[PDB]
Design a protein around this nucleic acid. Structure first.
Lengths: 299, 111, 299, 295, 107, 85, 106
DNA sequence: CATGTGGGAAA
DNA sequence: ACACAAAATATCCAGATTGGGGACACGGTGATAAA
């Protein structure tokens, strides 16, 4: 009623989304897991940038905008970041301070932005890395000596993987004054995510639809989940013992789960019996965020 | 292995010299008195060693490095210790890759 | 029946916990163990602060509260702490003093509180550290110089580890007049704690429920445990010989230990065999605590 | 039959119980050995105080107690100590009087008391110290200035070591009139002790149970043992050079936690030679204390 | 002895082919240097022919089909069983082993 | 079960040899070389040609084994018979 | 002895890389002051980027593979194998010497 | 600151 | 079903090139007290 936990995964597709750097002419990718295998990741700030872009897509006032200007990476920063900014600053982001001007910017607001209502974590490839690469290009020169680029015609490399990966996220429901107008935009945005990559000119990859398992409990930030699916994606084996004893045997109750796209699996018998406990009905994940966002929110 | 390190250096330099001698019928024995021959000799050595170095450095992996090394390189002649050196190689190869990179890159002519 | 012991581990997840500082632009992590490898740790005062915060979360009067002010880390002191405080001061904390006013504030209470009722040790990653890092960053620059931050747009690094770690704790039963009401809240909060880290906008994970090995006997603080689990997470191998023989052979008793989540491991015949003596029945730790707090307590 | 020696070790855990002070304010652990490696020790007074505390824990009379009072460290004088004190003073405790009260406490008891009876020694980490440390403290400042502490808030370091340490002890059998009742309690307490440190809000560890071996011999304090255990804990080698040649005799050893090692063949041959048939260290002190005693 | 078997069978195969093509018992070559030159030429021709033949085909069933048929290993009366039972990684590694052994024998 | 193939090959080869002092040695050496002609005919097969402890069980069981991994059987008669000579 | 060869390796790397990239040598640099200024600032830039790149990735494989760069300058004829074995085993003092040599050129 | 080397196996 | 034989010679890539540019952290703080 006051908390919301969920994890989101994706469809399989070849994905490069290069992030690293190397003079060795191979655009390395980030690996963090250590079980004798390498897994690709996507850092959360890229997803935060995509969320900001999508909040820009819908009508939502903002104080931070990315400008295309001189080679130094720069941001047009516009007005003072005030906590009463309709979309971006209030939802997340922080107000930095070096001098903090005089008398605390005329005794206004607070330069300590502690809360980031959207809590995000990195993704894990859940598929071992393969040393395959692609010999996709050779740089070539100019012949008419107009706006002449690098002198020679170089060669380099790139590597790709066929992978699908998931990430967890969470947020705590405390405010109801300004959040209901803006929170609905966040949930709609999460259903649709577009970007989160280096260059979509090649290997444009989108991870919008797949099974989802949102959970809202008045447990003060507590999760029985593990934040991980199988290679096939049937993580629900752990709940098999949990669902059977909803009524008795001193185990969690019937209103204890939510469904997603995975419900459309071939078998149907236990889905009929699982319907008696949870809201396992939404075949389309986009429809799920339309309803359970209402229940979690005030209306 | 230090003995196998010397083997790696020797086979690398031998491969370079033999491939240069076979491909462009050129012998260092004619060095004296023909400095222009020295220019094209160094040019050919540059070409072959640069190609080999880029090819070996291009990718790193167990199977790729192993089969490229055994196919495109001709090891020296020794009677028995090849079994010991190979079997020691097959558990760990990264150090062997670094050592052969060192041996091959040491072949660049000066200036 | 006068002492309570436990050691608690967590779920596997990546952890950032940026603690150290470096000019080389890498937020280092703390290492304490010497076996040829490095391990990640948690300072106990961090979970102490988290416990204070969740004592604030439930209705519990206090004297200590964190406020945001000038960069000197300050904490509001409210009323002068007294041993007959409700939640924070009585349960732990000392009333340090320099002058200590006159005649001990007219002989009110005493300026020496023995120590915290419950005592905890630091956590151990129980998984070797690896030199992996994430190139997660690219700070930018202000565009209109309004509230501008540092001039340049530098580069830096960060590192994370995929690890699950445990920690022990223990307490002794001394008071029973006022202690029970706040001990119930303490046990409830221990069943679900959240935080104990600087970065939760990024690298979010929760770590309270994984397994409980609780113990309560009038032995006056005896520990047969080593406070260590294995990678697979079960430690019953050395203690299976110890668990049985409740009647004879002078071996640790039947109602000497408690169960957890590891009881849901696949095999069941020996679970039934152990059921005859020990109280390894509770699969959910939160339910286990609600019963064993009552059992340890007077009621 | 009149002397008993023993050594005790424990489980691995981080360290605590600092004593030294630093100008730049890093808490420091004690260092003794100068051979290219460092070690952490504990003075016997701390564990003596803990033993006194747990003697207080069980129902036992005493003339000494620690009171929590003003900053000056003081101990309660209570009444005049007597040798026929039921628990503590008879067990140990030396009193020295500057004036010798009035006429040698009225020509009663004995003026100077010999502790004797109980002995102790250093505790050696048997694991080299490492330069690892953690900077931890970020103190607070009052926002209402109600009993405000120091103005500034600093950041200082503290170090811990993942280590387990051992210590020897010994006691001689001289009295049997009133001694056995208190000796039973002393053995029960030493079989399970706790604390022996100041910081227990942090760095909590307890060191009662592990592989213990004791020897009851009329040797008049001569010990073949080197008083040193294995770093890994398999110190058993000193037994192998000795047990096979039974020149200590057959009944010159005991057993503790180490006996539950999976190997069993030499346990059988040593069972017919040594009475180390105990797997629970608590049970060991229950029986061998009776053998040490006259009855 | 595992790899030693591969070395021995390769050396025996090349010697057997050289004996089939031209007279065996190299010790009869003796002093006449032209005999050594022609012997080395035939040796290297056979060796590099086999090298090319094995190099162009190193993919699972075809590789073993060419390897077992055209090569004559030792008897290995009863020790061969372990050599046969682990055939998968055996092939995966003896491709490189056989290539190395063949490359080892040049004049 | 490779040893079974080795045993049956050796036994059947000796059976053909028996069907029809350096003289004894050379006789065996030359005759075994003669029998190799039958094997080159057998190893010219691709899929379909030419099809001890017990008889009832093998037909009930080994018949299934023969038809699923016939590709494996090609190495057996080739590798094992050649190893003899 | 290997400290001197490491220093010579770093110096040769810097000079050869600069000469290959922007066809400049010491004498023409001595020609006119502007060329001292330009060559000097570019040398500062290249040595600084190399030092920044090498200051991280402090372990066996990462340091070895970053050593693979710079084309193993002036390794020359391998009269001595001890460098290949003992120095590869130590893998710690080499990083300090390389860092000091790179920092010495500014 | 630079190139070098051989020969067997079985009822 | 007897016997006979199970292939022979030349050759196995050629040339051009292997990244470019800008940037590697900003501020606040280093313990009080009794012997």
């Amino acid at each position: 009623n006051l908390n919301l936990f969920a994890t989101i995964l994706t469809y399989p597709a070849p994905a490069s989304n290069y992030r690293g750097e190397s003079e060795e002419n191979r655009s390395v990718i980030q690996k963090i897991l250590k079980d004798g295998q390498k897994y690709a990741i996507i850092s959360p700030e890229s997803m935060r940038n995509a969320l900001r872009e999508m909040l820009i897509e819908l009508g939502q006032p903002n104080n931070r905008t990315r400008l295309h200007s001189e080679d130094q990476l720069a941001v047009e920063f516009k007005e003072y970041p005030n906590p009463d900014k309709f979309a971006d600053d209030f939802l997340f982001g922080y107000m930095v301070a070096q001098t903090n001007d005089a008398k605390e910017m005329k005794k206004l607001n607070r330069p300590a932005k502690r809360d980031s209502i959207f809590r995000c974590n990195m993704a894990v490839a859940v598929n071992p890395y393969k040393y395959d690469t692609v010999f996709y290009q050779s740089p070539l020169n100019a012949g008419d000596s107009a706006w002449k680029n690098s002198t020679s015609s170089a060669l380099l490399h790139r590597e790709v993987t066929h992978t699908a990966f998931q990430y967890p996220f969470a947020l705590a429901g405390k405010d109801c004054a300004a959040k209901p107008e803006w929170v609905k935009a966040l949930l709609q945005a999460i259903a649709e995510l577009n970007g989160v990559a280096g260059g979509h000119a090649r290997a444009y990859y989108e991870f919008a639809p797949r099974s989802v398992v949102a959970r809202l409990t008045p447990k003060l930030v507590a999760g029985y989940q593990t934040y991980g699916f199988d290679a096939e994606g049937n993580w629900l084996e752990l709940s098999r013992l949990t669902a059977t004893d909803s009524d008795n045997l001193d185990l969690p109750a019937n209103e204890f789960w939510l469904g997603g796209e995975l419900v459309r699996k071939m078998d149907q018998e236990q889905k009929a019996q699982l319907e008696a406990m949870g809201a396992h009905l939404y075949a389309n994940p986009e429809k799920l965020f339309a309803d359970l966002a209402d229940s979690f929110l005030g209306v | 292995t230090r003995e196998y390190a010397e083997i790696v250096y020797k086979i690398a330099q031998g491969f370079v010299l033999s491939k240069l001698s076979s491909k462009h019928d050129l012998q260092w024995s004619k060095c004296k008195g023909n400095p222009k021959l020295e220019r094209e000799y160094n040019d050919k050595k540059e070409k072959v060693v640069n190609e080999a170095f880029l090819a070996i450095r291009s990718r790193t992996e167990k199977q790729a490095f192993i089969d490229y090394f055994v196919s495109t390189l001709y090891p020296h002649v020794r009677q028995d210790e090849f079994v010991d050196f190979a079997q020691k190689l097959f558990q760990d190869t990264d150090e062997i890759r670094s050592l052969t990179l060192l041996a091959l890159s040491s072949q660049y002519p000066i200036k």
